[PDB]
Ligand binder design. Structure first.
Ligand SMILES: [Cl-]
Ligand SMILES: [Cl-]
Ligand SMILES: [Cl-]
Ligand SMILES: [Cl-]
Lengths: 733, 733
């Protein structure tokens, strides 16, 4: 497939120069005020979306459990036990069917949002990740999917929902924020707001949006996304603490996922959250979690390849039956595990099913209760669960989560991977309690460290994940035990496989730029990765040549150049070549006054022109006759160019009958005179640093004599291409 | 004055190419392991430095108070009251005299460290901010100064101490970390570790080190400075909780400054930390704090100008008497205010002086106790202080702190400005309690918001300050009230004056690059700010010309160029000019095979050469005779060049008698062939973005025909120069 990258690099021409000349300091102040207002509105809307999801998820799950529990009781009295299972299966099948249909409406809504958000912040523009229909389909699918008990999450897709809101909202409201730079900034702000609403950590969201889109440090935009995040996480709170509780002005609880309070349960001699002796246990748990994450990634990748090979090339009826099958299998498994193998233990959140008086079923309590309740019980309750219960729950949940993720329904991954780790940590703590005394430390710390290790194994994130976990825990003293677990579980896992998101984005074939290049990559030069073949546009060019090159070629940008070695066309080109050059003596005076050879020809680089501007010029009557001088021109303004910005007409779409051939079109005013260039003798690391951090596109390579020698595109800087070229370079010598 | 900037931009030549060719993947892994070890060692050493400061500060202050309190009692019994004052004055004078002498040893140790650290991370290299003597003098001065009761802090200079440790330590231990890039990275890590040790907030330190040195996002170095910060803040804890308390494995308290625990004092109906109705109070307190900060900055700037005009041009005897005078004045004032105007209130930390039975003096309790104890009492004690006490303490402390800062002794600023705000907030809370019921909210919140507002007014920091305050508070729910106070007190203050650090760095005359440029600055072009005059070096140049240009000129870099329009010299230059050019046809074939006019002359740009490399070449026997070809050359290796890295000999220092004139020196191998260049038609914003974020130096401007037209240096991008050039541009038209 082929994808269109974002045009993040700024383009400055005469219309923009006129707008800048008209611009004044008061206008700049008004612009900044409007930008602040838009940021605040984005935060508020993301908070409202989170509230809308959470309220209906809770309502549906509570109603479903209310219908079944009584039926469980009556059908257990006589011993039928069937109607309880039949009603549960009916509810699950209905919800999963609705979610599958909704995903069938919009294909990109499937799976977690993060794989399709790391690409937009990197500038790949997956074809359907901004459209409002995607937002509606995903937000409706998430509530239906989790209500069906598919072992999924809600905190995942909230990032994509916030990203869509941030991308869309400013467009609805000197055109305002038409350039792709502003769109990318607002997408970053929306992603940060979504992360804050999901996890309750504002600084974690700011740091997540800082990376995954790594550009030059923009002090003044980070200060805006932090405000957006703070507003987003304190609007969800203001309503979720006013609906659940009675007080309205109170801010009693952070966003969707909260771990609780980490303190010694009772005033006890020598009770601490953690001590220096536990560090070995933390390291061992980290490496175990890394191995488990590697196994999870391996099985998930194999399953994804199998589905991509067989299931996808099937009619629309298939890919809908698979979700129903997995929902049925998981419902049957959870019901059987609640009925049998669940140890009844002597005693509102706790559910007692199939169990005698004054006793509760731990398996049922873990499986039925919503994931937040299960997490809270695993962290802050001691002695409630037997080790066999924990082992069975961990194995079943791990296998079912590994099998489930990837199917059509809008799954999540943070919670179902945050739940197995807690169970493993609690099991480890229970084992350690028997052999040695554990009174000197808290019990829930092991569960927290296990959860952190499993996340580190599965997703393999850094910096952002550490901050998110620390600010969710609400205890800064957990800074060290968590981090030394994230940096170990990662290092253990990188031996076997990459992260889930990297695996699922490499399957799509999307080209992604890595963070840094190896030293062997630096050994290469820039002359080895450029593309010697070029498509060029002369200034004052023929309209027939323009339409021919636009129809024949697929490149999105053309270097406007002049030959180095119609009569009016040639005369105008020579006049421009003499007018454009500026010598140092001239500048000082101004200050004081106050075959293959034909194919590969020397050309002097003058600028870059985008395909969109050429199409816009062709659509309008932008041309002059050969007899007439180039002075006469429509001279379109900025607003006229931006009028067609959201949707750019295709060249084949245009009728093109009106256009008169043998007509000269001037592209000098509308081109980008000064793009970032680089000498062919430069090394790969500098080129990669520029092309990544500056976020630009189509980096031209020009030699010492001003001859343009090549163009570098993102396809030339992927890891596979660099590795292949390095292997070829070793093969040459 | 003139200052030498850091050479952050990487230089790649043939010795480095040889080292890279010898380099292997295993060697890279070993390099990364060594770098991690160095980072951890830096963190540990910074923690140890913090512990060393804190322990002796506590010991000295406790001993001084132990000597005086008994003498206070006996001399009060008869009514003399003199010996108590005499002993206090003697102690204060001795400590302040020692601190003043120690600062007299090293001039740069004076004042807070931050003004001299913002310059190094920006690349200015203040002449004495890395030397170990500065570290020793500052660390010894801080403990003596605060023990004298000069109304100063300890958290300020810890940043400079960590920076010095990070700069120095790797040098003590393929040369390792010789390039200035590694030195700057380690300085950033040391600054982050120092901030973490001072305030107990690791992420705050990471974010402080991220800004103030804004460069391209380096994922893989942030992940190292975060580890350094975490290790630094958890080594100070491990010892300060094992010395003060009894348990050794326990981590009971964060770094030097801790705010405590923010919870409702008793289980009470409708008790919350804060509610939505308080936001107006927070905004009003923020604007009041902004006005107060503006006043503080105004008076401090006027006093600093007065001292710079009169006090500084004086012999060394002066500038030592001023510190003694201020110490005497503050001791007399504090003793008198403790004796009189301190209201005795009915009842170990609390001090009862000059007061009858079962009563304590609030003035004495606030003034005598260490600043941490005063802060803790102001935050978490209600009803202890009368409003008159608070007003008098605030006024006196504000005036004395404004007068004190700037003198020789190593003062701090965070604590003395964090203490007035707390008093103001407590006074506001006490006033509000009388008029309206305040039972619905906590009392200390007003003190915290007042402190945050006063810091925002005085220092005017963002992002970093917010995170530092949030992670010191240990309550994420304070995210919004703090931040909406920082962003208001800043906006209120920016009307009148800049921050303290900006004022004190603008007085030194140091050129600093601002974060962003205005749109009017973008209206300017690059041709208007470049310097048309150049000093150039031909390849294969005469040694006499080299020595003449090195002695005559002061520029630190020379563009190696060739004329565009000895016989052996000219022949070699022409041969190099033909050998260097690479045409696109040639590259494709290679792949397939597999007066004033004399003064201002057209020159083709070939590279950049630093003065240091030229001096190194001159020191060694790097030359060849005219008859001999250029093939023969000593061909120095990387280690030989780096051997002289720490100290570069001056040209005037060299005897130069051995050097034989009329001898050709080849500089082609040792130059930087591919520096970042920019076209003269580019706009100012792009140039500023490159020259800032890439951290480079001496950005060359070359036109379309390859002619070099100018050089841009940091002196051309300061705010004053840009404003002057913009005014001139308006004047022209
Ligand atoms: Cl999630
Ligand atoms: Cl996810
Ligand atoms: Cl301080
Ligand atoms: Cl300071």
């Amino acid at each position: 497939k082929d994808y269109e990258s974002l045009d993040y690099d700024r383009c400055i021409n005469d219309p923009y120069l006129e707008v800048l000349e008209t611009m004044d300091n008061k206008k700049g102040r008004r612009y900044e005020a409007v930008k602040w207002m838009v940021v605040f509105a984005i935060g508020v809307c993301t908070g409202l979306v989170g509230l809308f999801v959470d309220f209906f998820v809770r309502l549906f799950t509570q109603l479903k459990f209310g219908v079944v529990q009584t039926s469980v009781e009556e059908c257990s009295q006589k011993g039928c036990l069937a109607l309880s299972l039949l009603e549960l299966l009916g509810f699950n099948l209905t919800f999963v069917f609705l979610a599958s249909l909704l995903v069938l409406i919009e294909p990109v809504a499937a799976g977690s949002g993060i794989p399709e958000v790391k690409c937009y912040l990197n500038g790949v523009k997956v074809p359907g990740i901004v459209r409002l229909r995607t937002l509606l389909c995903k937000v409706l699918g998430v509530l239906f999917s989790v209500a069906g008990g598919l072992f999924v999450e809600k905190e995942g897709p909230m990032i994509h929902s916030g990203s869509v809101v941030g991308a869309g909202l400013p467009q609805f409201q000197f055109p305002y924020f038409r350039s792709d730079r502003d769109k990318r900034d607002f997408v970053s702000a929306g992603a940060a707001a979504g992360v804050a609403a999901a996890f309750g950590a504002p600084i974690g969201g700011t740091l997540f949006s800082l990376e995954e889109g790594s550009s030059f440090w923009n002090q003044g935009l980070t200060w805006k996304v932090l405000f957006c995040s703070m507003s987003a996480t304190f609007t969800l709170n203001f309503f979720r603490s006013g609906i659940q509780f009675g007080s309205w002005g109170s801010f009693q609880l952070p966003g969707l996922l909260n771990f609780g309070e980490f303190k010694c349960s009772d005033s006890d001699k020598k009770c601490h959250l953690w001590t220096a002796m536990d560090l070995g246990f933390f390291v061992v748990m980290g490496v175990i979690g890394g191995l488990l994450g590697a196994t999870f990634n391996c099985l998930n990748k194999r399953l994804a390849k199998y589905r991509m090979r067989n299931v996808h090339p099937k009619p629309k009826l298939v890919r809908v039956l698979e979700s129903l099958l997995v929902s049925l299998v998981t419902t049957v498994v959870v019901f059987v595990a609640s009925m049998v193998l669940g140890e009844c233990r002597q005693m509102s959140s706790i559910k007692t099913f199939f169990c005698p008086n004054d006793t509760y079923n731990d398996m049922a309590t873990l499986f039925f209760n919503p994931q937040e309740s299960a997490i809270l019980q695993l962290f802050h309750q001691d002695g409630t669960f037997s080790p066999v219960t924990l082992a069975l729950f961990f194995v079943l949940y791990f296998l079912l989560a590994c099998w489930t993720y990837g199917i059509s329904v809008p799954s999540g991954l943070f919670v179902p991977s945050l739940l197995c780790g807690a169970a493993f940590g609690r099991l480890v703590a229970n084992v350690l309690k028997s052999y040695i005394g554990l009174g000197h430390i808290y019990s829930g710390t092991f569960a927290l460290i296990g959860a952190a290790a499993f996340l580190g194994g599965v997703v393999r994130m850094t910096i952002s994940l550490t901050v998110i976990l620390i600010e969710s825990t609400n205890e800064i003293t957990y800074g060290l035990p968590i981090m030394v677990t994230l940096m170990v579980a990662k290092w253990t896992g990188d031996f076997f496989n990459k992260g889930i998101y990297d695996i699922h984005v490499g399957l799509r074939g999307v080209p992604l730029l890595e963070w840094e290049t190896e030293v062997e990559m630096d050994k290469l030069r820039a002359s080895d990765i450029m593309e010697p073949n070029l498509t060029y546009v002369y200034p004052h060019t023929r309209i027939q040549s323009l339409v021919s090159i636009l129809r024949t070629t697929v490149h999105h940008a053309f270097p406007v150049v002049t030959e180095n070695r119609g009569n009016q066309l040639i005369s105008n080109n020579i006049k421009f070549k003499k007018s454009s050059i500026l010598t140092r003596a001239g500048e000082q005076r101004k200050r004081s006054q106050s075959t293959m050879e034909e194919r590969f020809r020397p050309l002097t680089f003058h600028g870059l022109i985008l395909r969109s501007q050429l199409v816009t010029l062709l659509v309008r009557g932008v041309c002059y006759s050969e007899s007439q001088s180039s002075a006469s021109q429509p001279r379109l303004s900025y607003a006229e160019m931006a009028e067609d910005y959201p949707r750019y007409p295709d060249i084949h779409d245009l009728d093109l009958t009106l256009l008169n051939p043998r007509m000269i079109v001037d592209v000098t005013p509308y081109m980008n005179p000064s793009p970032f260039t680089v000498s062919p003798n430069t090394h790969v690391s500098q080129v990669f640093n520029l092309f990544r951090t500056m976020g630009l596109r189509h980096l031209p390579v020009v030699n010492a004599v001003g001859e343009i020698v090549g163009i570098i595109t993102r396809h030339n800087l992927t890891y596979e291409f660099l590795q292949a070229r390095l292997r070829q370079h070793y093969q040459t010598i």
